[PDB]
Design a protein around this ligand. Structure first.
Ligand SMILES: C[C@H](NC(=O)c1ccc(CN)cc1)c1cccc2c(-c3ccc(CN4CCOCC4)nc3)c(C(=O)O)[nH]c12
Ligand SMILES: [Zn+2]
Ligand SMILES: [Zn+2]
Length: 232
């Protein structure tokens, strides 16, 4: 009923959308992993009379449900998708997207990691993102590589028309106590990568984490704090 939707409010397999700004939505789905249930976010950005998707809904059936929810709520075609790192909450569902006419993209680093891990593999490589601080335009967004954080390949996404920063899994929600799933993380570089984001996007008005509730710029400092403490 208008609040940001939380894990126990979304059965696994349904998807909900949340309007962030004009022409910007998040998508929220839930999935089981190792016997626990988790929410996850992605982004939808209006691209004229088409849509750009950022990240899958964490699984094939969830991603099919995402496409149906988009058709119901927005009614414009998803033509392109970007996955922001190689984990299944970002790429699981790419094969569904590719069979639904969506052109799928990720950095070469993400594509290599996804292939090696046995995850679904976006079709197209995003060059120009291999060095920390790199940025490229992609439709109505800017893609930014902040350096290693949650993963070595993690990208963040900025929507300049709305000053929306989508941090993906490099950014945690304000209630976070822990750095989340850190198996592929660089805890030592993560704060430096967050500082890069802070420096590059000082006008961000909304910050969206990979999992959990959006907020403002404080999510960036909170993330640095929690990762440093975790490492400690
Ligand atoms: C899909 C992703 N697979 C990996 O990561 C992965 C998988 C396999 C291998 C081994 N080669 C290596 C890594 C993932 C799964 C489950 C939870 C998460 C989380 C996550 C997010 C938030 C929290 C915190 N909540 C815990 C419950 O109580 C409330 C707070 N815990 C975990 C993330 C993430 O942090 O991005 N990713 C996940
Ligand atoms: Zn991840
Ligand atoms: Zn994640």
């Amino acid at each position: 009923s208008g609040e940001y939707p939380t894990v126990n409010e979304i059965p696994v397999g349904e998807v909900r959308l949340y309007q962030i700004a004009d022409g910007v939505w998040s998508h929220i789905a839930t999935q089981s992993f190792d016997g626990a249930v988790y929410p996850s976010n992605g982004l939808i950005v209006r691209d004229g009379d088409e849509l750009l998707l950022i990240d899958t809904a964490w699984g094939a059936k969830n991603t099919a449900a995402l496409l149906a929810e988009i058709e119901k709520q927005i009614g414009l075609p998803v033509t392109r998708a970007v996955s922001t790192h190689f984990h299944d909450d970002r790429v699981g569902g790419v094969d569904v997207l590719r069979a639904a006419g969506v052109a799928t993209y990720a950095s070469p680093s993400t594509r290599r990691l996804a292939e090696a891990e046995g995850n679904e593999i976006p079709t197209h490589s995003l060059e120009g993102l291999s060095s920390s601080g790199d940025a490229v335009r992609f439709g109505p967004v800017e893609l930014f590589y902040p350096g290693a954080a949650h993963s070595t390949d993690n990208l963040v996404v900025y929507v300049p028309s709305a000053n929306v920063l989508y941090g993906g899994c490099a950014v945690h929600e304000l209630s976070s106590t822990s750095a989340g799933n850190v198996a592929d993380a660089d805890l030592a570089e993560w704060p430096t990568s967050v500082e890069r984001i802070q420096k590059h996007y000082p006008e961000a008005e909304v910050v969206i984490p990979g999992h959990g509730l959006p907020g403002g710029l404080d999510l960036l400092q909170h993330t640095a704090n929690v990762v440093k403490a975790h490492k400690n």
